[PDB]
Design a protein around this motif. Structure first.
Motif, PDB file in Angstrom:
ATOM      1  N   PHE A 180       1.384   5.229  -0.234  1.00 36.53           N
ATOM      2  CA  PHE A 180       0.477   6.325   0.193  1.00 36.53           C
ATOM      3  C   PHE A 180      -0.501   5.853   1.283  1.00 36.53           C
ATOM      4  O   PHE A 180      -0.071   5.188   2.231  1.00 36.53           O
ATOM      5  N   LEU A 181      -1.792   6.180   1.169  1.00 31.48           N
ATOM      6  CA  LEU A 181      -2.745   5.838   2.249  1.00 31.48           C
ATOM      7  C   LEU A 181      -4.133   5.313   1.856  1.00 31.48           C
ATOM      8  O   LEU A 181      -4.521   5.396   0.690  1.00 31.48           O
ATOM      9  N   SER A 186       0.817  -1.205   0.000  1.00 27.50           N
ATOM     10  CA  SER A 186       0.000   0.000   0.000  1.00 27.50           C
ATOM     11  C   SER A 186       0.852   1.256   0.000  1.00 27.50           C
ATOM     12  O   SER A 186       1.088   1.848   1.054  1.00 27.50           O
ATOM     13  N   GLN A 237       0.066  15.123   0.550  1.00 29.44           N
ATOM     14  CA  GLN A 237      -0.257  13.722   0.780  1.00 29.44           C
ATOM     15  C   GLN A 237       0.734  13.129   1.768  1.00 29.44           C
ATOM     16  O   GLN A 237       1.924  13.451   1.734  1.00 29.44           O
ATOM     17  N   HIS A 238       0.239  12.256   2.641  1.00 28.35           N
ATOM     18  CA  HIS A 238       1.056  11.614   3.662  1.00 28.35           C
ATOM     19  C   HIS A 238       1.473  10.221   3.211  1.00 28.35           C
ATOM     20  O   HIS A 238       0.702   9.510   2.562  1.00 28.35           O
ATOM     21  N   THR A 239       2.694   9.840   3.565  1.00 28.24           N
ATOM     22  CA  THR A 239       3.259   8.544   3.223  1.00 28.24           C
ATOM     23  C   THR A 239       3.385   7.679   4.474  1.00 28.24           C
ATOM     24  O   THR A 239       3.452   8.180   5.599  1.00 28.24           O
ATOM     25  N   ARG A 240       3.408   6.366   4.262  1.00 25.19           N
ATOM     26  CA  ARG A 240       3.587   5.426   5.356  1.00 25.19           C
ATOM     27  C   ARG A 240       5.006   5.522   5.912  1.00 25.19           C
ATOM     28  O   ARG A 240       5.896   6.145   5.326  1.00 25.19           O
TER      29      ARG A 240
END
Lengths: 81, 80, 81
Positions: free
Chosen positions: A3-4, A1, B60-63
């Motif tokens: 991004f989110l 996965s 946007q945020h990333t893991r």
């Protein structure tokens, strides 16, 4: 996965009794029950710091709890209330 | 079941105060991360974004990334 | 410009339903929507200090928000409420 992903929420509603209909003002009243459920690892905790398996909040809306714990929660509203 | 979360690890060599859990860093290092000798698989995602008149800024945020990993990105317009 | 200028506000209103008319007390009730928009550089912020592009206030009037953020905002009221 990469991004989110959006958090998945399960919802259910039941109607117990229709208690009134207004034919001039065009509104009706209903009594029922609502239930929500979701999964979020950010709300997880370790039992050894409280010695409990269930952590509960009572007599508060979702917005109030979200403001108190400073975490995003799925607040809701009735559109035609 | 298994469990998930973050952790803090303190390692000592001939330092009996470590088992108390309060050992402050001292001396010269002796251990290192093992994964820094190797490498893993790849994850790729492609998304289409549009910048409206009132939405000209987007984030946007990333893991979480483990130590030693790498990150790449590129953007190409649809047209002119 | 040498002189200070007035901030420009865009307004819009829509009527959804007339829900009642009282012919003896001379009043009526209505349901609708209201929208306001204006531009003020003093409310601007830098994204790198919050990681967000939109900052929002909910369940509060314009007067309350103006009192909280210590900046003048275009509050309004209904004249014949």
């Amino acid at each position: 996965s990469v991004f989110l992903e959006s958090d998945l929420v399960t919802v259910g509603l039941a109607v117990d009794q229709i208690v009134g209909v207004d034919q001039r003002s065009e509104n009706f009243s209903v009594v029922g029950t609502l239930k929500l459920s979701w999964h979020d690892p950010k709300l997880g905790f370790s039992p050894d710091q409280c010695g409990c398996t269930v952590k509960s909040f009572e007599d508060a809306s979702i917005r109030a709890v979200a403001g108190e714990i400073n975490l995003p929660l799925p607040s809701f509203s009735f559109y035609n209330q | 079941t298994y469990t998930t979360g973050s952790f803090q690890l303190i390692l000592g060599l001939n330092a009996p105060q470590v088992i108390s859990g309060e050992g402050e860093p001292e001396g010269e290092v002796f251990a290192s991360l093992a994964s820094l000798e190797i490498k893993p698989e790849a994850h790729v995602q492609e998304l289409e974004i549009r910048l409206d008149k009132d939405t000209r800024y987007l984030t946007q945020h990333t893991r979480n990334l483990q130590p030693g990993d790498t990150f790449h990105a590129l953007v190409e317009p649809i047209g002119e």
